[PDB]
Amino acid sequence: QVQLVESGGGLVQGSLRLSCAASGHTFNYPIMGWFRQAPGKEREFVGAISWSGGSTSYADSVKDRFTISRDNAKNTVYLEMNNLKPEDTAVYYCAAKGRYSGGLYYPTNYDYWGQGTQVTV
Amino acid sequence: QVQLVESGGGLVQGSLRLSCAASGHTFNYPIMGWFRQAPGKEREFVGAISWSGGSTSYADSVKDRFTISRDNAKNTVYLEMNNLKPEDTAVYYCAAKGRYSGGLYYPTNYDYWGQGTQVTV
Amino acid sequence: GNMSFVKETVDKLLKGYDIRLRPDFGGPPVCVGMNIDIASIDMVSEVNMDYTLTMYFQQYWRDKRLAYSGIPLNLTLDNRVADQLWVPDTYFLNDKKSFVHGVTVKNRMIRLHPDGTVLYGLRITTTAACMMDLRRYPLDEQNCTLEIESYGYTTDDIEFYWRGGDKAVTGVERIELPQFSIVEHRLVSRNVVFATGAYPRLSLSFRLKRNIGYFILQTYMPSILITILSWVSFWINYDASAARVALGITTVLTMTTINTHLRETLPKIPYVKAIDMYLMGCFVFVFLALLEYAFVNYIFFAIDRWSRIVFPFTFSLFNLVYWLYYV
Amino acid sequence: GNMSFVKETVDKLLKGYDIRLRPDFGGPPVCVGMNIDIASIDMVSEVNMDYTLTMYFQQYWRDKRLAYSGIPLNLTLDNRVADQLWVPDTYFLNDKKSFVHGVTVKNRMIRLHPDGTVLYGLRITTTAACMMDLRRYPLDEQNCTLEIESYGYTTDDIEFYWRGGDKAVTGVERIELPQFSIVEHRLVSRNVVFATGAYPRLSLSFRLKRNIGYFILQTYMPSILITILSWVSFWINYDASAARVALGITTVLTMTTINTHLRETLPKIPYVKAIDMYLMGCFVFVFLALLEYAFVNYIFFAIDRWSRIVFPFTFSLFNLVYWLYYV
Amino acid sequence: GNMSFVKETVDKLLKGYDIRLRPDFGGPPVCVGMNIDIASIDMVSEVNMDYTLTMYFQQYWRDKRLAYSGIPLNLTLDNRVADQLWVPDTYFLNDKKSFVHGVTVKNRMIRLHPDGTVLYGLRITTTAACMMDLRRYPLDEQNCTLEIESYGYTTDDIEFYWRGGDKAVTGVERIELPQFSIVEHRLVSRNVVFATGAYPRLSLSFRLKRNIGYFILQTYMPSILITILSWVSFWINYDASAARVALGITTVLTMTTINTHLRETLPKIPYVKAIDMYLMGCFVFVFLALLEYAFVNYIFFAIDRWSRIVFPFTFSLFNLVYWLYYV
Amino acid sequence: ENFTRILDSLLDGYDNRLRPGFGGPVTEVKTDIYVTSFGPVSDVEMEYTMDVFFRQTWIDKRLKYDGPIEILRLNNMMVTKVWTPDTFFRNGKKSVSHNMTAPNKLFRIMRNGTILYTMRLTISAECPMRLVDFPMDGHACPLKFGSYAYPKSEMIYTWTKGPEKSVEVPKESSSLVQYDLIGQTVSSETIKSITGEYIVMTVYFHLRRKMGYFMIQTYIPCIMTVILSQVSFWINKESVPARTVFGITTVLTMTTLSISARHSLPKVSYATAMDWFIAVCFAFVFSALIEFAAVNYFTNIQMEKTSKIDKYARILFPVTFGAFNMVYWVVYLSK
Amino acid sequence: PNLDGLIAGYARNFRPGIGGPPVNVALALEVASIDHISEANMEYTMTVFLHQSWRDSRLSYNHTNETLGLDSRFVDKLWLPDTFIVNAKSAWFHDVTVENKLIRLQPDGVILYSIRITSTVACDMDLAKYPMDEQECMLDLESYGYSSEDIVYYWSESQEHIHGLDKLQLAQFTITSYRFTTELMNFKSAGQFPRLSLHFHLRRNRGVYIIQSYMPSVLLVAMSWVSFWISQAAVPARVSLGITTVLTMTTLMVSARSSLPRASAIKALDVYFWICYVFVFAALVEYAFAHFNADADTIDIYARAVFPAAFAAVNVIYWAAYA
Ligand SMILES: *[C@@H]1O[C@H](CO)[C@@H](O[C@@H]2O[C@H](CO)[C@@H](O[C@@H]3O[C@H](CO[C@H]4O[C@H](CO)[C@@H](O)[C@H](O)[C@@H]4O)[C@@H](O)[C@H](O[C@H]4O[C@H](CO)[C@@H](O)[C@H](O)[C@@H]4O)[C@@H]3O)[C@H](O)[C@H]2NC(C)=O)[C@H](O)[C@H]1NC(C)=O
Ligand SMILES: *[C@@H]1O[C@H](CO)[C@@H](O[C@@H]2O[C@H](CO)[C@@H](O[C@@H]3O[C@H](CO[C@H]4O[C@H](CO)[C@@H](O)[C@H](O)[C@@H]4O)[C@@H](O)[C@H](O[C@H]4O[C@H](CO)[C@@H](O)[C@H](O)[C@@H]4O)[C@@H]3O)[C@H](O)[C@H]2NC(C)=O)[C@H](O)[C@H]1NC(C)=O
Ligand SMILES: *[C@@H]1O[C@H](CO)[C@@H](O)[C@H](O)[C@H]1NC(C)=O
Ligand SMILES: *[C@@H]1O[C@H](CO)[C@@H](O)[C@H](O)[C@H]1NC(C)=O
Ligand SMILES: NCCc1c[nH]cn1
Ligand SMILES: NCCc1c[nH]cn1
Structure with missing residues (x-):
């Protein structure tokens, strides 16, 4: 039982910092993923971070552009969207993955989906 | 060697509390079962409780109606028969099951049978 | 009854049978029903973060290649026939070490049914991983799962379900762990996606609640008794330097030995547990009791009376806050 | 004597023999007689709640497919023939780890009889579960069983009995456990019902009585000696603050080390044992002896004489009540 | 869909198939692609200088002998077919003990593709050697590798590559070691030359950073508290010989027990670690505190006040230098 | 079937139960060892572990083939079909042939019939040890292998290269913790049994123990405990309780150190070098308490009608203990 | 063929x-x-x-x-x-x-x-x-x-x-x-x-292994004899010396049978510890008897000779029985 609230999207022309605040049984769900769904297109993997250790992985599109990290005190994850592009225009969602729930990349493996900030540039 | 005395049956129209008081070598017989035998019909499983842990199981008929629990101080088990029905009209028996004596549901697996309170409604 | 007739029927079933091909190969997935009868949970290890389970694991499926007519019986066959049949490639994804019992024979069953239903049973002992959150230890509740999956067949080829739904797993009442009570068990079904495709998954989980009693006796009570012992100093004359300093040292050092011993029974976690917080509180009390004497000693060359009341009262406050937060 | 004749006879027996089918398949159940010769009980573990048994396990049954004529001998065959025969699917339901000894060959026997009786013997070492009630430990009596069952064949197909009734199990007198005496053994026969049907069961149980002697020496006597040591304080002058406080501390702390050490040798049970009750009583005595001095110390700035009599006498009462309740 | 058709096709593939000969025997090397999915790192042992890894190990290659036409599917076959196929002779050069999981079946997959590509997957647990540099322990960073090589085939016959390059290894984020964080992983490919020829090598390495938190609590903090305890002596009157000598002894001896205990948890290395340097510094402080009293004692039959300032200040300097050098 | 026919022809009329040249010339097997990792040495169990590439070479004319390719690199399944030497390790307590993802065996057939057969083995072997000079001691752990069933009249063992170069232990392969591999000596011998006379090939690994661990674990606490006891001499004789505690704790500490030293060390009848050091240090610590007892006993007589005993003890005790250290270290470090 | x-x-x-x-x-x-x-x-x-x-x-x-x-x-x-x-x-x-x-x-x-x-x-x-x-x-x-x-x-x-x-x-x-x-x-x-x-x-x-087994027990008995030469005036000194020998002997007995968890039989080593425990316990009782009566110096003088002689005598009997 995890609740995710994300904020800090909006519209810009640029560096941005999406944030994702978790609460509840985060122990059972050690991984947080960032997805993004463009209008029409399928929901697409952006990156993921382990709560413990901060082991990080990125999709190629955003590799060496976006940076994820977290702070366990607040139970918060942030997608630091630097060097934005007009391809980066989607509803960015946050989601939690169970320990044994499969590959990072596949949104069907994730159980608890944030609301989803729309971001246009 | 276990002795079981049950009481608190009787006739009502309603909530009822059957009780089942055990004495003797209860360690070898960690499970207590409640059965009921309607006139003519076969002896029928109602529910069972582990002495240690209180892990409980119920037949479908009485699921979310009857509630079993125990207190190890008195060596007593109780069937709290709430929301009674005219189907619930039988000689309710208490019985003890050995550790390795098979499935909960089968009265032939049980060794030490209480007297059996008749209950009519 | 006619054994030559039964032998003929079974020989015909296995003639040209290809173990390499699943039932309905190339067609809709084979539905495999699974039910578990738990025999025991032998051990739960915090240091290794695992538990050991013994169960009777049974698989139900239909293989139309094995359908037989003219015999109104279910055929129980010698377990060695399993080597001539297709069976599912079921594995336990979070298992560490598992085996099928082998005495006096391999603890395995095969029962055939006239419609081609195959019943395949195994008696398995598994040590399975269980990551534990020890932040509230030993007032903690753990979730230990068993993850059941098809190794190589995707959901295009095989599907799992809990046969009987919520009654597919029996014997949870048999589990008798001294240190834990089983609060609840749950059955889940889902599909898990990997790079090689989507695979069927069944998950069995238990909620384990640690029994406090052992810890009260083993760690909590000695710490309380050492802390009370430390207070005896305040009723001794301030000239009794050897006596009062001895009390301070022995209680302080005893609390260190208790702390270090305890954490050698547990994994090398980097965070503070509930029990650590208690021992650290008790250490501070007994250390301050010795420092109180140093202060008395420091000026003599009323404070004791004030110590006689404030220290036990503060320890009561400390305990109240602690046990409310965690219980 | 004619080995070609015997070879021909045995070859004929095994020609077209189907290991998959039990004797009298489809007919009345095959009666399997079982007898056990106990070799040893190697170990009894409280921490793991199990014991290790070595036995010669023998199974008796009739297989009319193996009947032979014209040879008035019982044929002892090489143990490898067992792989070409049907054998019962016997297992030990409460076993944790078992194996058939394999040096210099598999410790297995097959003896055929002219009427088709098969004698099948195995030498097995088994570690088997035994849940122990440690409430009276170490003055406890335990019941450890071995549960013998058919894995896959129901009572429609196979039946078990103790061959020889109460003499089916030999060698109980050989068991030499230092910490236990075997009081009694019993043989039981019953049917056990599961979801898959009714199965034959044989149960062998032993009653084990713990020998107190080790515990008297290891735990009881040190605790008595520490408690007596605590009383020496009452014969020391009340001005000897360092000496009398030292006695109080050392005895109190020694009783804590004894307690905590002891429970590290045992499983993490949540209840109080008999030995725990004794150690808690001894702790209270030695703690009160130190508190007695604090009281003397408290007022000096008759009680000792009254302590010299009341403390040893109360300890005698404590011991009397304890050892009467538990012995 | 037609199982007789699929059976015919597969039978034809395996008819006259020689497992002894690699694909393209006598021709260019077979390219074998490898990808790893990490399941867990169960344990890291300083004493044994090894770690235990569980992974899904998959091998990709083309065997033109297994190419099939007229079926637009990938054939997932029962894992027992692997015994009838050639597979690479891959081994882990730095492994100590490894096994393929065997419940409920051998955790093995075979998937064939129409062009003759074979996908071969195994679930393996390996204990692998990892020589550790403990000079900075427990503020150390370790490099643990897994070396993957062909046992008998040279680079004339077989070649390895990471299938997917830097994405060939997944699941590094799943690794949850309490005592370590995974900083980085790297994938390397090279050829290794031996007397028997040049062999293909793939290397997977991880950088592990030890978490300090456990060590702060377990060793560093007790040593700090003992050192502070030693200073209490300087506030006691110099006539309190028993009290001040007791403080000196107990702190000195406690620091010895801490030292010797610690090094019994670690391998018998001949060099000094970071933690050894800290404990040796703390020992010197507490030993000098006792020697300070001997000096005071020596002349009495100002120094204490000067000790009250210089000792805590020097300990602060010692800690500053230490933690700057190593953090 | 260009190569399938060749392999079938070689295996046709081939009996793996008969050694090459059966009943005639002695079969010569060339063996070389590549040590991949020299594992830890267990002093308590007197055993050592090692992972090696055990290579064997012999000539089998029955497998001579005429083909375009010079060397046939075959799968390890071919090993069971052909004859291989039955080499076993005489001093091996427990050995494992690795089987991960494949049987770790190499099998190559040359056109001359020469066969190269290498297997990856983890060997645990007996290493008898004389711990008289422990911890300043060196041991030579042997490794003896030979034919179990074929005597010297049927099969002989020779090192493939020269005896010096046949066993190669790279410096990277050293997994030793408390030992250093000085070098290896290679030799062969013959032994006689009821079965027959067999060729035995022996490899001796010369290990020198590193005393850095034992210096700080045992010697330093023992030395400091002796120094700690001598502090009581400078304490005034009037502080009887203070000096008494000094003697008691040091004696108890030496008891703990003596037990801990023999904890990991195996139990032997003879006395190790470290045992003598502990025993002498125990005498010095005990004599310190005896010295205070003499001081207390003699001052009461003086009181009943600033101590000479302490003044001599403050000098004689450090000198005698210092003299013992010079004698103890020189004698053992010279060996 | x-x-x-x-x-x-x-x-x-x-x-x-x-x-x-x-x-x-x-x-x-x-x-x-x-x-x-x-x-x-x-x-x-x-x-x-x-x-x-x-x-x-x-x-x-x-x-x-x-x-x-x-x-x-x-x-x-x-x-x-x-x-x-x-x-x-x-x-x-x-x-x-x-x-x-x-x-x-x-x-x-x-x-x-x-x-x-x-x-x-x-x-x-x-x-x-x-x-x-x-x-x-x-x-x-x-x-x-x-x-x-x-x-x-x-x-x-x-x-x-x-x-x-x-x-x-x-x-x-x-x-x-x-x-x-x-x-x-x-x-x-x-x-x-x-x-x-x-x-x-x-x-x-029989060698250093046996010597090491009996070494702490004998030394604790010898350490108790040191209190006899210590003046009775120093009450904390003799009491602290007496208690440490007894407590260490108690820990030795516990640790002696720890190496053999299931050895419930009587061992000759266990018997020797009891003999050592009696002597170290008697020495503390000897001072307590002397301290109580001093509210005598002859008691210490006898203790300086009786205890070494009694311990020597019982050792001869003990070693003669186990040969
Ligand atoms: C120990 O911790 C584990 C997690 O690590 C817990 O396991 C979770 O258990 C909960 C139930 O308690 C699971 O939630 C359920 O998941 C089912 C599967 O849904 C997936 O698959 C379907 C297709 O089959 C997809 O459509 C779906 O998107 C998912 O991908 C759902 O079917 C369930 O839905 C039902 O209940 C919900 C309310 O909970 C209703 O709203 C629905 O209408 C429906 O009735 C449910 O959502 C969860 O998936 C489990 N997680 C994992 C990782 O397996 C254990 O429960 C826990 N142990 C204890 C004792 O608490
Ligand atoms: C350790 O603890 C175990 C239990 O956990 C004890 O095992 C019990 O042993 C007793 C005997 O001491 C068993 O009691 C006997 O059961 C037999 C089986 O009866 C079942 O099966 C028959 C059909 O075969 C059914 O008709 C019946 O209803 C049962 O389902 C009975 O045949 C026995 O009856 C005989 O004795 C009684 C008196 O005891 C007479 O009245 C009868 O006429 C008849 O002569 C008997 O009742 C009990 O079943 C065992 N329990 C289990 C679970 O196996 C061990 O004995 C104990 N160890 C020690 C050393 O005490
Ligand atoms: C055959 O040729 C190989 C080529 O490497 C050589 O090593 C071997 O010694 C030769 N054999 C003989 C008997 O000459
Ligand atoms: C055969 O065995 C018997 C019994 O051990 C023995 O007496 C006899 O000498 C043996 N025969 C030979 C020839 O050794
Ligand atoms: N049962 C799916 C195993 C797996 C992991 N990664 C790829 N396949
Ligand atoms: N021998 C019966 C095993 C079993 C348990 N549950 C179902 N069958």
């Missing part, structure tokens, strides 16, 4: 002369090593070269007069005696690099079968005189399924020479004597089974 002919028609499931007289099996042992002699587990590990010799007329060949040296591959083809170790907790074969077995077939039909096996053998040990005790361990060999009517065992003549027990070097024990015994009256449940047993007597070495 003729090797395949011998296997052709060979009956593996039947002993030579199934209906005739029992097969004589010569038995020889070569004890390579003895190790892991644990008193707590009451077991020892032994590695032996078991040699079995018997005659099988089915394998008699007359084409050549030379013995056939065969490897472990041919073992599975032939019938073998079902010899097993009666008192073996666990045992296994050495299969590196191959199975350590050999079959040597002679033209007359005599078969030599040798196997290298390592077995953990249970050995009941009497710890009454521990550590000054001698233990006798046995190695029982017997046919599992064939009674005296089928297989009869006997020690070979070569057994007296290649036993190899003299060459063994044990860390803590010494093999004082060994004996090979034949017992034809086992009479198991199936029938009469001849049993061959090897008895060897182990004597625990």
